[PDB]
Write an enzyme that holds these catalytic residues in place. Structure first.
Site, PDB file in Angstrom:
ATOM      1  N   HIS A 169       2.795   3.568   6.532  1.00 49.78           N
ATOM      2  CA  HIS A 169       3.688   5.384   6.441  1.00 49.78           C
ATOM      3  C   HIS A 169       4.657   5.482   6.403  1.00 49.78           C
ATOM      4  CE1 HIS A 169      -0.991   6.364   8.177  1.00 49.78           C
ATOM      5  NE2 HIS A 169      -1.255   5.545   6.730  1.00 49.78           N
TER       6      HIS A 169
ATOM      7  N   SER B 181       4.541   4.264   0.360  1.00 45.78           N
ATOM      8  CA  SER B 181       3.981   3.358  -0.197  1.00 45.78           C
ATOM      9  C   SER B 181       4.825   2.489  -1.451  1.00 45.78           C
ATOM     10  CB  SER B 181       2.704   3.544   0.001  1.00 45.78           C
ATOM     11  OG  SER B 181       1.875   3.178  -1.751  1.00 45.78           O
TER      12      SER B 181
ATOM     13  N   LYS C 180     -10.242   8.135  -6.392  1.00 44.56           N
ATOM     14  CA  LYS C 180     -10.049   7.598  -7.012  1.00 44.56           C
ATOM     15  C   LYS C 180     -11.085   5.712  -5.764  1.00 44.56           C
ATOM     16  CE  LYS C 180      -6.546   4.568  -8.257  1.00 44.56           C
ATOM     17  NZ  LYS C 180      -7.194   3.759  -9.973  1.00 44.56           N
ATOM     18  N   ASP C 181     -10.006   6.059  -4.832  1.00 48.27           N
ATOM     19  CA  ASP C 181     -10.650   4.339  -3.954  1.00 48.27           C
ATOM     20  C   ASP C 181     -12.289   4.855  -3.861  1.00 48.27           C
ATOM     21  OD1 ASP C 181      -8.263   4.038  -4.155  1.00 48.27           O
ATOM     22  OD2 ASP C 181      -8.307   4.592  -1.913  1.00 48.27           O
TER      23      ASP C 181
ATOM     24  N   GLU D 190     -16.629 -24.716   2.294  1.00 48.83           N
ATOM     25  CA  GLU D 190     -17.011 -23.490   1.873  1.00 48.83           C
ATOM     26  C   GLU D 190     -15.505 -23.304   1.022  1.00 48.83           C
ATOM     27  OE1 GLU D 190     -16.327 -23.802   4.644  1.00 48.83           O
ATOM     28  OE2 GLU D 190     -15.245 -22.534   6.173  1.00 48.83           O
TER      29      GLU D 190
HETATM   30  C1  HEM Z   1      -8.640  -5.447   5.930  1.00 46.49           C
HETATM   31  C2  HEM Z   1      -7.452  -6.026   6.251  1.00 46.49           C
HETATM   32  C3  HEM Z   1      -5.927  -5.088   5.593  1.00 46.49           C
HETATM   33  C4  HEM Z   1      -5.744  -3.384   5.734  1.00 46.49           C
HETATM   34  C5  HEM Z   1      -7.057  -2.600   6.239  1.00 46.49           C
HETATM   35  C6  HEM Z   1      -4.220  -3.589   5.144  1.00 46.49           C
HETATM   36  C7  HEM Z   1      -4.032  -1.964   4.986  1.00 46.49           C
HETATM   37  C8  HEM Z   1      -4.534  -2.961   3.201  1.00 46.49           C
HETATM   38  C9  HEM Z   1      -4.443  -1.431   2.499  1.00 46.49           C
HETATM   39  C10 HEM Z   1      -5.275  -0.941   3.012  1.00 46.49           C
HETATM   40  C11 HEM Z   1      -2.914  -1.116   1.688  1.00 46.49           C
HETATM   41  C12 HEM Z   1      -2.390  -0.441   1.288  1.00 46.49           C
HETATM   42  C13 HEM Z   1      -2.603  -0.059  -0.060  1.00 46.49           C
HETATM   43  C14 HEM Z   1      -4.055   0.417  -0.771  1.00 46.49           C
HETATM   44  O1  HEM Z   1      -5.086  -0.031   0.136  1.00 46.49           O
HETATM   45  O2  HEM Z   1      -3.880   1.583  -1.037  1.00 46.49           O
HETATM   46  C15 HEM Z   1      -2.748  -2.560   2.079  1.00 46.49           C
HETATM   47  C16 HEM Z   1      -1.395  -2.078   3.174  1.00 46.49           C
HETATM   48  C17 HEM Z   1      -0.683  -3.280   3.081  1.00 46.49           C
HETATM   49  N1  HEM Z   1      -1.231  -4.526   3.153  1.00 46.49           N
HETATM   50 FE1  HEM Z   1      -2.651  -4.933   3.676  1.00 46.49          FE
HETATM   51  N2  HEM Z   1      -3.804  -4.612   4.796  1.00 46.49           N
HETATM   52  C18 HEM Z   1      -5.459  -5.454   5.194  1.00 46.49           C
HETATM   53  C19 HEM Z   1      -4.931  -7.627   5.012  1.00 46.49           C
HETATM   54  C20 HEM Z   1      -3.091  -7.669   4.159  1.00 46.49           C
HETATM   55  C21 HEM Z   1      -2.983  -9.430   3.980  1.00 46.49           C
HETATM   56  C22 HEM Z   1      -3.681 -10.078   4.353  1.00 46.49           C
HETATM   57  C23 HEM Z   1      -2.313  -8.442   2.995  1.00 46.49           C
HETATM   58  C24 HEM Z   1      -1.549 -10.198   2.567  1.00 46.49           C
HETATM   59  C25 HEM Z   1       0.947 -10.329   3.241  1.00 46.49           C
HETATM   60  C26 HEM Z   1      -1.669  -7.563   3.404  1.00 46.49           C
HETATM   61  C27 HEM Z   1      -0.108  -7.007   3.265  1.00 46.49           C
HETATM   62  C28 HEM Z   1       0.033  -5.334   2.311  1.00 46.49           C
HETATM   63  C29 HEM Z   1       0.911  -4.504   2.173  1.00 46.49           C
HETATM   64  C30 HEM Z   1       1.976  -5.201   1.628  1.00 46.49           C
HETATM   65  C31 HEM Z   1       0.790  -3.011   2.022  1.00 46.49           C
HETATM   66  C32 HEM Z   1       1.714  -1.993   1.950  1.00 46.49           C
HETATM   67  C33 HEM Z   1       0.891  -1.279   0.753  1.00 46.49           C
HETATM   68  C34 HEM Z   1       1.656  -1.356  -0.717  1.00 46.49           C
HETATM   69  O3  HEM Z   1       3.109  -1.208  -0.223  1.00 46.49           O
HETATM   70  O4  HEM Z   1       0.956  -1.813  -1.988  1.00 46.49           O
HETATM   71  N3  HEM Z   1      -2.557  -7.001   3.859  1.00 46.49           N
HETATM   72  N4  HEM Z   1      -3.386  -3.551   3.024  1.00 46.49           N
END
Ligand code: HEM
Ligand SMILES: CCCCCCCCCCCCCCCCCC(=O)OC[C@H](COP(=O)([O-])OCC(O)COP(=O)([O-])OC[C@@H](COC(=O)CCCCCCCCCCCCCCCCC)OC(=O)CCCCCCCCCCCCCCCCC)OC(=O)CCCCCCCCCCCCCCCCC
Ligand SMILES: CCCCCCCCCCCCCCCCCC(=O)OC[C@H](COP(=O)([O-])OCC(O)COP(=O)([O-])OC[C@@H](COC(=O)CCCCCCCCCCCCCCCCC)OC(=O)CCCCCCCCCCCCCCCCC)OC(=O)CCCCCCCCCCCCCCCCC
Ligand SMILES: CCCCCCCCCCCCCCCCC[C@@H](O)O[C@H](CO[C@H](O)CCCCCCCCCCCCCCC)COP(=O)(O)OCC[N+](C)(C)C
Ligand SMILES: CCCCCCCC/C=C\CCCCCCCC(=O)OC[C@H](COP(=O)(O)OCCN)OC(=O)CCCCCCC/C=C\CCCCCCCC
Ligand SMILES: CCCCCCCC/C=C\CCCCCCCC(=O)OC[C@H](COP(=O)(O)OCCN)OC(=O)CCCCCCC/C=C\CCCCCCCC
Ligand code: HEM
Lengths: 79, 120, 51, 62, 106, 378, 49
Positions: free
Chosen positions: F200, F204, F226-227, F270
């Site tokens: 935040h 983004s 959208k989501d 798996e």
């Molecule tokens: C299920 C657990 C996770 C959640 C809830 C989470 C939050 C998710 C979600 C909600 C976004 C924001 C973009 C969107 O969905 O609209 C993204 C935030 C972010 N996450 Fe995670 N994340 C998770 C696991 C990971 C993993 C394993 C990586 C790899 C390193 C990762 C890299 C990012 C990045 C780079 C953002 C920033 C959003 C952006 O700049 O587009 N996330 N992911």
């Protein structure tokens, strides 16, 4: 915070919208998009296809080849 | 001011809804009195009333006499107020214009979101 | 606590009653629809999920 | 032109949110039974004879 | 040492210029570069007449990609036309960063 | 007066999920992270309803699983939803990593690293939950994979002895895994909240890659619906893959009760681990296979330092995007090689696939990024 | 790139702070000797047992 009330400088750029209710949801939704889809397509198929085709080829390559090292053995092992 | 843009709005649309549901008659007579004062205040002087003659005829025709206007102000009731406000404020598409900078100001749907209370 | 009392408040509740009462009816019938409540389903000519 | 039955239908249930929720509720109540039993009789109808409910007759009421 | 072959370099840099999509959106090359904090402060250096042009073009492209539809065939940028305005700004940012570092090392 | 800005908690949600500024030009790829956020809770409740029957005993567990699949009222749906749904979790998760790597949302360093730790956590939860159902693959798989740490010259063989709680897989080791498996997901939630909390306050990423601070747009009117649509369509993927393809997703063999005695023909791990396991085939010395195994996930950290191309993304650069697709293809390679029973051609293909899998990013990407920079005064 | 750290003032910082590095590293080494029951270095000191 970083909320809208104070952000980047921006000036005499102007918006023209419409009330959603006054306009129908699908303005030529078909005919407009297809050439777009197809142009995006011809744009990136050039950069997407070859890894996958090379992969498929190596797939049947190793599967069929090793299979030839596999089913065909009794002749390969001779009498 | 830039930081309160939404805020005035945040209240303003409510006012319209405030006029919709739960419009107290005390508020109604308040507005009527201020209205009557607005008429009599407009009608002081020569030029303003020469104009009244000069526009009322283009309008209804008539000079449209004040006895009629005030009979017509006594005519109004809170029920009628809530009805008309319902017929214009309650769920109707806004036409909005701004010259700012504007940035805090909500996008149309969000603005449109306020025209109808979720509670009603 | 006495503030709730008032000339507008009487008129006000009088005004808000249709909207909130409607919700109760909507909430009640909908809740019957959600728990699939029995004895009223006896009274519906159409929606008898029972044979 | 003259308002569509849909148009006056807006001025009815849609514009008021309580009545809107209401028609959502009655609409759910009808969509439930009707679609449910539709899926019933149709599913019964497609791959017919695979069903034992029609094959209950080998062993029911003697 | 390159000289005589340079033509062909330009003959693929243009293809490389085509290789990037920004021309299809018509954006300045300078617009494309990532904003780390120092280059941001170089953005701060810009005159308003040049600044708002940049901002507007960027918002245009941002609207396009939301529609995915490309900027119109006529408007697409020429390799010559894209002024590289930020050059003094960034090159001074480099000179100054490497400056204060150059003192920091001794 | 203001209601969302009244209550401080509401102030927080309004700083976020109600109306955080967002880029407008976002595509579905950004919808995927939100899809992860969708899957997570679903697995949690699903695993809760499953946790209303499953036992962690060496003996009594499998009978209780049979209690699930046959006794429980529509619980079979729940069983497959937890399984296949986890599969979907990894599905979306992989796309998500691909996105963050592709549009360079890894530029948000701390956010990125929390994503990494979150990734390892998900891997562990995966493995242990996979051990739980208690069957042939469960047993021999857990045994074999656990054995890997014994590659350590001193500590690791000791350490396996410590996990097992005994000489071998047993109610000790099984209950152990049941508990770790349970405790981690809740950890994953907090890491998620922390993750978004880093997100935040940097803003983004946008599909353009170039900043859209000027074009920031309200969240609630737009991206929420959208989501919602995106989650509903994933719900389609999942429900169609469960009501119409109940079994295929996994590895039958677990369907056999585990025997320390009886030993399965092939013990394929798996599918999400298959590329990882393929790397176990990669080189002589089990130690180095473990090293490269951990390195396969660890290597991601290098990238933000390895990154140097002027894009914050990878869509206006089909050049490096091509190296990218070569790398993705390489992952497909390690995948399918990991799927097959071990063989020599598979061995050499896995070798070069692994070397190139490291070198595209340790050699090709940065340096081609440099020449790409040379072409246009970058 | 990385040449900026490669300076006499920084190499100076190296010469200044190195003994301290040996200090804390030795401290954590001893902590390994103790908390982990690292008997191998416990064996180096006679006083144990
Ligand atoms: C299920 C657990 C996770 C959640 C809830 C989470 C939050 C998710 C979600 C909600 C976004 C924001 C973009 C969107 O969905 O609209 C993204 C935030 C972010 N996450 Fe995670 N994340 C998770 C696991 C990971 C993993 C394993 C990586 C790899 C390193 C990762 C890299 C990012 C990045 C780079 C953002 C920033 C959003 C952006 O700049 O587009 N996330 N992911
Ligand atoms: C399941 C596994 C998970 C991955 C699936 C993603 C979920 C689906 C989704 O995202 O919603 C659709 C989603 C909606 O469009 P969008 O969100 O505006 O895309 C924005 C992209 O960032 C902008 O990129 P893009 O959407 O333009 O993708 C570029 C693509 C151009 O392809 C597309 O834009 C969409 C084509 C897919 C529909 C195919 C024709 C209709 C049937 O060109 C190529 O990469 C290769 C061209 C050859 C493909 C043939 C396309 C037409 C036939 O489209 C996608 O991005 C998904 C990928 C579709 C192309 C796959 C080609 C496979 C061969
Ligand atoms: C404790 C004492 C309780 C006090 C309650 C006082 C009554 C007011 C109230 O409850 O507001 C909600 C709302 C009042 O909305 P309103 O009358 O238009 O005035 C709100 C102002 O605009 C206030 O301005 P606003 O900006 O906050 O309005 C935007 C919108 C807030 O909408 C959003 O932007 C939030 C969206 C988050 C969704 C994220 C999804 C992620 C995937 O307003 C809401 O809070 C309603 C959202 C509906 C969901 C309920 C959320 C509760 C937490 O009342 C209702 O929603 C109840 C009627 C419909 C519910 C169905 C009941 C069937 C049984
Ligand atoms: C996480 C794991 C996966 C989850 C799986 C679930 C997937 C769910 C996806 C389903 C999609 C739901 C769509 C939501 C529909 C409405 C969304 C919203 O955008 O609509 C709002 C509108 O909201 C709806 O109209 C309110 C309908 C009220 C019905 C409430 C349902 C009650 C359910 C209660 C639960 C009962 C079961 C209890 C069991 C214990 C916006 O209002 P607007 O577009 O401006 O039009 C109305 C304007 N008015 C007032 C002037 C008319
Ligand atoms: C007794 C009184 C009880 C009343 C309680 C009423 C609460 C019932 C539902 C509350 C859920 C709130 C989520 C609704 C989302 C939403 O806001 O959709 C838009 C709509 C209208 O919004 P506006 O037009 O902006 O309103 C402006 C009015 N001037 O509001 C709605 O209520 C419709 C809801 C549809 C959207 C669905 C998405 C909601 C968010 C879901 C995320 C929940 C995740 C939680 C998971 C936790 C699991 C343990
Ligand atoms: C085993 C089976 C498991 C299933 C998992 C599915 C994962 C496979 C993903 C393959 C999808 C192939 C479709 C690609 C569509 C495509 O080419 O989109 C084109 C588009 C170009 O768009 P622009 O740059 O905006 O250009 C606009 C020009 N005007 O390219 C993109 O979308 C790239 C962004 C998408 C990223 C997602 C990639 C998915 C692959 C994930 C695997 C890689 C992650 C590796 C991490 C592993 C760590 C342990
Ligand atoms: C995303 C993180 C999680 C993963 C990867 C995971 C592993 C998933 C998956 C893969 C299944 C296995 C089903 C099978 O293989 O047949 C299930 C294993 C299990 N998980 Fe989790 N789990 C996760 C979070 C939870 C939570 C939060 C709970 C409880 C609330 C839970 C309770 C179970 C149970 C009981 C099993 C064994 C089910 C069986 O025997 O088939 N899981 N979940």
């Amino acid at each position: 915070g970083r909320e809208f009330g104070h952000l980047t400088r921006m000036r005499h750029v102007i918006t023209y919208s419409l009330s959603p209710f006054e306009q129908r949801a699908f303005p030529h939704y078909f005919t407009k998009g297809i050439p777009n889809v197809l142009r995006r397509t011809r744009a990136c198929i050039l950069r997407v296809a070859p890894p996958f085709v090379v992969f498929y080829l190596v797939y049947t390559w190793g599967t069929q080849e090793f299979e030839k090292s596999k089913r065909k053995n009794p002749a390969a092992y001779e009498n | 001011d830039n930081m309160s843009i939404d805020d005035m709005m945040f209240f303003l649309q409510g006012q319209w809804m405030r006029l919709c549901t739960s419009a107290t008659e005390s508020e109604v007579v308040r507005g009527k009195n201020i209205l009557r004062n607005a008429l009599v205040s407009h009608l002081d002087g020569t030029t303003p009333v020469c104009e009244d003659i000069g526009r009322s005829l283009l309008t209804y025709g008539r000079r449209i006499p004040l006895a009629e206007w005030e009979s017509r102000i006594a005519e109004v009731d809170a029920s009628v107020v809530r009805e008309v406000c319902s017929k214009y404020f309650y769920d109707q598409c806004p036409a909005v214009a701004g010259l700012g900078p504007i940035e805090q100001l909500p996008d149309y749907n969000r603005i449109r979101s306020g025209m109808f209370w979720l509670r009603f | 606590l006495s503030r709730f009392l008032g000339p507008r408040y009487r008129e006000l509740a009088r005004n808000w009653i249709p909207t909130a009462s409607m919700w109760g009816a909507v909430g009640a019938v909908g809740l019957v629809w959600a728990t699939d409540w029995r004895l009223i389903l006896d009274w519906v000519p159409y929606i008898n999920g029972k044979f | 032109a003259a308002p569509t039955l849909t148009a006056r239908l807006y001025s009815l249930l849609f514009r008021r949110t309580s009545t809107f929720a209401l028609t959502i509720a009655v609409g759910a109540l009808f969509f439930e039974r009707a679609f449910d039993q539709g899926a019933d009789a149709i599913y019964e109808h497609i791959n017919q004879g695979k069903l034992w409910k029609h094959i209950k007759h080998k062993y029911e009421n003697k | 040492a390159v000289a005589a072959s340079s033509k062909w370099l330009e003959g693929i840099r243009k293809w490389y210029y085509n290789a990037a999509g920004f021309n299809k959106l018509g954006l300045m090359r300078d617009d494309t570069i990532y904003e780390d904090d120092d280059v941001k402060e170089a953005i701060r250096r810009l005159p308003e007449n040049l600044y708002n042009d940049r901002v507007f073009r960027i918002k245009r492209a941002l609207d396009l990609t939301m529609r995915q539809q490309i900027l119109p065939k006529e408007q697409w940028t020429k390799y010559e036309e894209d002024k590289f305005y930020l050059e003094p700004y960034l090159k001074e940012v480099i000179r100054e960063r490497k400056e204060r570092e150059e003192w920091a090392k001794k | 007066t203001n209601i969302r800005k009244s209550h401080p908690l509401m102030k927080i949600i309004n700083n976020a999920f109600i109306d955080l500024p967002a880029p407008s030009n976002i595509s579905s790829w950004w919808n995927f992270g939100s899809l992860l956020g969708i899957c997570l809770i679903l697995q949690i409740l699903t695993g809760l309803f499953l946790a209303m029957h499953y036992t962690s005993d060496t003996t009594t567990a499998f009978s209780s699983v049979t209690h699930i699949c046959r006794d429980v009222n529509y619980g079979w749906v729940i069983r497959y939803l937890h399984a296949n749904g986890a599969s979907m979790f990894f599905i979306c998760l992989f796309i998500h990593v691909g996105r963050g790597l592709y549009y360079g949302s890894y530029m948000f360093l701390e956010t990125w690293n929390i994503g990494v730790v979150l990734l390892f956590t998900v891997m562990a939860t995966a493995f242990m939950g996979y051990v739980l159902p208690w069957g042939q693959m469960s047993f021999w798989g857990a045994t074999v994979i656990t054995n890997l740490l014994s590659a350590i010259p001193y500590i690791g063989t000791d350490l396996v002895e410590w996990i097992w709680g005994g000489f071998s897989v047993d109610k000790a080791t099984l209950t152990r895994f049941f508990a770790f498996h349970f405790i981690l997901p809740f950890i994953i939630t907090a890491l998620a909240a922390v993750h978004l909390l880093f997100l935040h306050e940097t803003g983004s990423n946008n599909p353009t890659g170039i900043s859209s601070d000027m074009d920031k747009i309200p969240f609630h009117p737009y991206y929420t619906i959208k989501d919602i649509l995106g989650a509903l369509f994933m719900m389609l993927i999942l429900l169609i893959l469960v009501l119409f393809s109940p079994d295929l997703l996994g590895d039958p063999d677990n369907y056999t009760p585990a025997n320390p005695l009886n030993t399965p023909p092939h013990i394929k791990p798996e599918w999400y681990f298959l590329f990882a396991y393929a790397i176990l085939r990669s080189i002589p010395n089990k130690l180095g296979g473990v090293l490269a195994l951990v390195a396969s996930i660890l290597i991601l950290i290098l990238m933000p330092m390895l990154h140097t191309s002027k894009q914050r993304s990878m869509m206006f650069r089909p050049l490096s995007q091509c190296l990218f697709w070569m790398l993705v293809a390489d992952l497909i390679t390690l995948t399918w090689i990991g799927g097959q029973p071990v063989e020599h051609p598979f061995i050499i293909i896995g070798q070069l696939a692994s070397i190139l899998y490291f070198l595209i990013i340790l050699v090709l990407m940065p340096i081609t990024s440099i020449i790409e920079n040379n072409l246009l005064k970058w």
